[PDB]
Design a protein around this ligand. Structure first.
Ligand SMILES: COc1ccc(CC(=O)Nc2cncc(OCC(=O)N3CCNC(=O)C3)c2)cc1
Length: 186
């Protein structure tokens, strides 16, 4: 099946807990996969304009590890619940992808999660201005604008709204698309 095939692909790239004890400032992100209309999608947030870090930017759900978290995956799930109302029974964490090093002292660990079909986002407006889906296949043939660095523009055909996706967030989206969609029969 589509979902069994995605999980099987993802497991081959799982690094597990290999980098998780290193003494960094630690953040986790959740890369949330949603199946709709017979295709996989990623769920993104737009960050509230009130936030100190990166107001108004497109981001995956996530945030800084705190003492309550049993592990890095727990960080991602806690923050996702705060931001968009995703409950733990509504997500299956499938793997941990390559972590992202930034600023010399920070390590961001990305986890891919399969999202239940009955989840409906409840954006928390103190943290998130918007929540939206992009089909995974978009990231194989994105609409690129050079700003010099590459920016993706995605227009939602439901409403005509255009979102800009860039940086670590864009890079991770492409990685997930390659992992799941490469070399597939039609
Ligand atoms: C250091 O590089 C990273 C590491 C992790 C992340 C993921 C991330 O933050 N996702 C997120 C998505 N949408 C809305 C969000 O609002 C919550 C928020 O940003 N908070 C929580 C209240 N106070 C804060 O200081 C910050 C957060 C982004 C960048």
């Amino acid at each position: 099946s589509m979902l069994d095939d995605a999980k099987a692909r993802l497991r081959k790239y799982d690094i597990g807990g290999k980098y998780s004890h290193l003494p960094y400032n630690k953040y986790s992100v959740l890369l949330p996969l949603v199946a709709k209309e017979g295709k996989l999608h990623l769920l993104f947030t737009v960050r509230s304009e009130k936030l100190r870090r990166a107001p108004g930017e497109v981001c995956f759900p996530g945030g800084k590890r705190d003492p309550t978290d049993m592990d890095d995956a727990a960080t991602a799930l806690r923050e996702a619940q705060e931001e968009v109302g995703l409950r733990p029974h509504q997500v299956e964490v499938v793997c941990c992808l390559v972590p992202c090093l930034i600023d010399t002292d920070t390590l961001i660990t990305p986890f891919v999660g399969l999202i239940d079909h009955n989840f409906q986002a409840q954006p928390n407006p103190a943290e998130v201005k918007d929540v939206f889906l992009v089909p995974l296949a978009y990231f194989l043939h994105p609409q690129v604008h050079d700003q010099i660095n590459h920016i993706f523009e995605y227009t939602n055909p439901e409403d005509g709204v255009t979102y800009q996706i860039k940086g670590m967030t864009a890079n991770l989206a492409v990685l997930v698309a390659f992992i799941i969609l490469e070399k597939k029969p039609t």
